[PDB]
Amino acid sequence: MTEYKLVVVGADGVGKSALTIQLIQNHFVDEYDPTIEDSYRKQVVIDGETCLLDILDTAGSAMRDQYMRTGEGFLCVFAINNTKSFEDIHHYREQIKRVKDSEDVPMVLVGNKCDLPSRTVDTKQAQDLARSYGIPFIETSAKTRQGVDDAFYTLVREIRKHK
Amino acid sequence: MTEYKLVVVGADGVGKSALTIQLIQNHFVDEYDPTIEDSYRKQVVIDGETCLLDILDTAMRDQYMRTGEGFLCVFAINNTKSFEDIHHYREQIKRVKDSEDVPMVLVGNKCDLPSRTVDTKQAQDLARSYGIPFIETSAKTRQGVDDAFYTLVREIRKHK
Amino acid sequence: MTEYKLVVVGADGVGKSALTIQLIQNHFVDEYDPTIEDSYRKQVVIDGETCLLDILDTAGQSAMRDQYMRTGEGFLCVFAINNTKSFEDIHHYREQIKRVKDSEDVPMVLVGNKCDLPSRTVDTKQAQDLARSYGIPFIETSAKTRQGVDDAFYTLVREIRKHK
Ligand SMILES: O=C1N[C@H](c2c(CNCCCCCCNCc3[nH]c4ccccc4c3[C@H]3NC(=O)c4ccc(O)cc43)[nH]c3ccccc23)c2cc(O)ccc21
Ligand SMILES: O=C1N[C@H](c2c(CNCCCCCCNCc3[nH]c4ccccc4c3[C@H]3NC(=O)c4ccc(O)cc43)[nH]c3ccccc23)c2cc(O)ccc21
Ligand SMILES: Nc1nc2c(ncn2[C@@H]2O[C@H](COP(=O)(O)OP(=O)(O)O)[C@@H](O)[C@H]2O)c(=O)[nH]1
Ligand SMILES: Nc1nc2c(ncn2[C@@H]2O[C@H](COP(=O)(O)OP(=O)(O)O)[C@@H](O)[C@H]2O)c(=O)[nH]1
Ligand SMILES: Nc1nc2c(ncn2[C@@H]2O[C@H](COP(=O)(O)OP(=O)(O)O)[C@@H](O)[C@H]2O)c(=O)[nH]1
Ligand SMILES: [Mg+2]
Ligand SMILES: [Mg+2]
Ligand SMILES: [Mg+2]
């Protein structure tokens, strides 16, 4: 069975752990220690092909470069009520591009917390950024699970197209 | 013995030759003809490993960019234009070597002078956007000179 | 933690499963279903560096085979010292791995298993000569006594580290 290493990145508090555990366990965690960096496996079917997801939920330089080199695709998560988290995204894109020395790393832009009313990042703004990178943009709520499968499955499709 | 081809680039007058000759000879040259482009060797020990530095002191540029393994991008701290040239060097090297991760060090030379026009924070932010180190040097006093070249070698080593 | 994907290949009955379970569990299995192809993880320290071994114990010996050869980073090529045919198979495994990975220098270790049995038909010198012709190490093992088992897998990890 084919296996894909996916890395979830983004600023503190955006929902990386909540998204990861929703995908892996169909479980919503309200309180997850922000210092724990762990990986999880799940077997899924995407477009009729069974594969194993190996998902790194990043927390906090040498160690960072290492998991960027072995990761095959990246979920770049911001929170739609936190403009700083959205303005940080380009730093993640730039680091990944440099560490993997590639202009075409499989990546998906994720706008999390879409269930909340206090939106400060426009959808159009995130769509425009994703379009400048030529990557998909998916809005998620780890709380309701809306868009969660979409974000990870779309990342796998990006890896498959790249190969 | 492993050898490393290093290329010193930067605007006229920033101190490329003075830095190169301080590294190679432990000698400060006050003048040095600005038209002379030459290479120099020196055997050094870095992190317990003996290696040969092959350093090109620049005045096709494409040829030596392709051959060079790491680049010292030098500006002078009292010359704002030389700092504004830095991004042009980075973009050329990136294109010619076709890589987003070329071993590079940003060098702010002439740190002994008082007439500073480029802020340390400004150069630090630029290096940080490139993911490369920033080292302030004085080829006149030799402060930071070994640090700049040795750090560049360490960048090459990590890359491989 | 760095992770290494290692693949154990060789003819039916040479001891691939017995070797893998000795490494992972410190346990000798006298009978293990020859049809089961599975992978196992173990965290080990080699030369002061902690790493995760992810070891595929191959059973059937085309498309899935090509897949795990492309994914595997290093290969234990196992024969049994009382089975000349299994030794004559080795060059076929080497040629397949070379083709599938498109590389003349794939990390590999030649393993001569069952060194505890008396009915040897493959000479140590014969195996050393073959390994020398490939530029890879040769390690004699017994999955029964566990002699050489750590050596075979650790040496393969060292080959991967040197290749990188
Ligand atoms: O694609 C195939 N995979 C197969 C296979 C397996 C099974 N694998 C099961 C997962 C095991 C996860 C182990 C924790 N993996 C942990 C994990 N998950 C991540 C997710 C993203 C990024 C990094 C990681 C890591 C980290 N790994 C690093 O090196 C690292 C560095 C710094 C970090 O900080 C984090 C990490 N074992 C094999 C051994 C040989 C050949 C093939 C295989 C297989 C068989 C087959 O017939 C056909 C195809 C395939
Ligand atoms: O790593 C090893 N090196 C070893 C070795 C040597 C020694 N070499 C030392 C002389 C150094 C040349 C001095 C000109 N080198 C001149 C020089 N220095 C530079 C620095 C940066 C960029 C370019 C250059 C150049 C230029 N070369 C170009 O193509 C070019 C284009 C445009 C320009 O304008 C400038 C240049 N000779 C060998 C022959 C075969 C195999 C190995 C070697 C060795 C032996 C060994 O047992 C184990 C390991 C190694
Ligand atoms: N309302 C809402 N809250 C969320 C969502 N995702 C995460 N959270 C909350 O935001 C906080 C930070 O989540 P966490 O998973 O720890 O974020 P991390 O630091 O990126 O790992 C936690 O209180 C979560 O319960 C979401 O989609 N909607
Ligand atoms: N005060 C001071 N002067 C320097 C330093 N480095 C170079 N210079 C002087 O600046 C001028 C240009 O130096 P040079 O090495 O020829 O620059 P290049 O054109 O980049 O090769 C010379 O007069 C040098 O003596 C330094 O660190 N401090
Ligand atoms: N005496 C001895 N028997 C072994 C050794 N390794 C494996 N065996 C036995 O040889 C048979 C085949 O082993 P197995 O692990 O199933 O081989 P595989 O088909 O390559 O996976 C089993 O009966 C094992 O107990 C060894 O080093 N010494
Ligand atoms: Mg977290
Ligand atoms: Mg000069
Ligand atoms: Mg078996």
In chain A, DSSP assigns E strands to: 3-10, 38-46, 49-57, 73-79, 107-112, 137-139
The whole-angstrom separation of Cα B78 and Cα C80 is 73
Residues on chain C touching A3 (C-beta within 8 angstroms): 71
What residue of A is the nearest CA neighbor of C4?
Answer: A70
Backbone phi, psi, residue C42, to 5°: -150, 135
* Domains of chain A: total: 1
CATH assignment of the domain containing A44: 3.40.50.300
The whole-angstrom separation of Cα A65 and Cα A107 is 16
Method by which the coordinates were obtained = X-ray
The candidate with the shortest Cα–Cα distance to B57, out of B90, B82, B21, is B21
Q: CA angle, B125 as apex, B120 and B128 as ends, to 5°?
A: 125
SS3 call for C130? helix
Residue A31 alpha carbon to ligand 6 centre in Å? 9
Q: How far is A22 from chain B (nearest CA, A)?
A: 33
Helices A16-25 and A148-162: crossing angle in degrees, nearest 10, is: 90
Proportion of chain B in helix, strand, coil states, percent, rounded to 5? 40, 25, 35
SS3 call for A92? helix
In the stretch 57-86 of chain C, residues with CB closer than 8 A to chain A read 67, 71
Residue A150 alpha carbon to ligand 7 centre in Å? 57
Residues on chain A touching C2 (C-beta within 8 angstroms): 66
Domain that holds residue C19: 3-163
Size of interface A-B (CB pairs under 8 A): 13
Yes or no: say if B132 and B155 are a contact pair by the CB < 8 Å rule.
Answer: yes
Q: Who's near A15: CB < 8 A, 6+ residues apart?
A: A77, A79, A112, A113, A140, A142
| Burial call C132-158: b when 16+ CB within 10 Å, e when fewer | eebebbbbbbbbbeeebbbebbbbbbb
Q: Who's near A144: CB < 8 A, 6+ residues apart?
A: A115
Helices A123-133 and A89-99: crossing angle in degrees, nearest 10, is: 10
| Secondary structure element (H or E) that encloses residue B6, with its range | strand B3-9
Residue C71 alpha carbon to ligand 1 centre in Å? 9
The candidate with the shortest Cα–Cα distance to A91, out of A12, A9, A20, A8, is A9
The whole-angstrom separation of Cα C86 and Cα C99 is 20
Resolution in A: 1.9
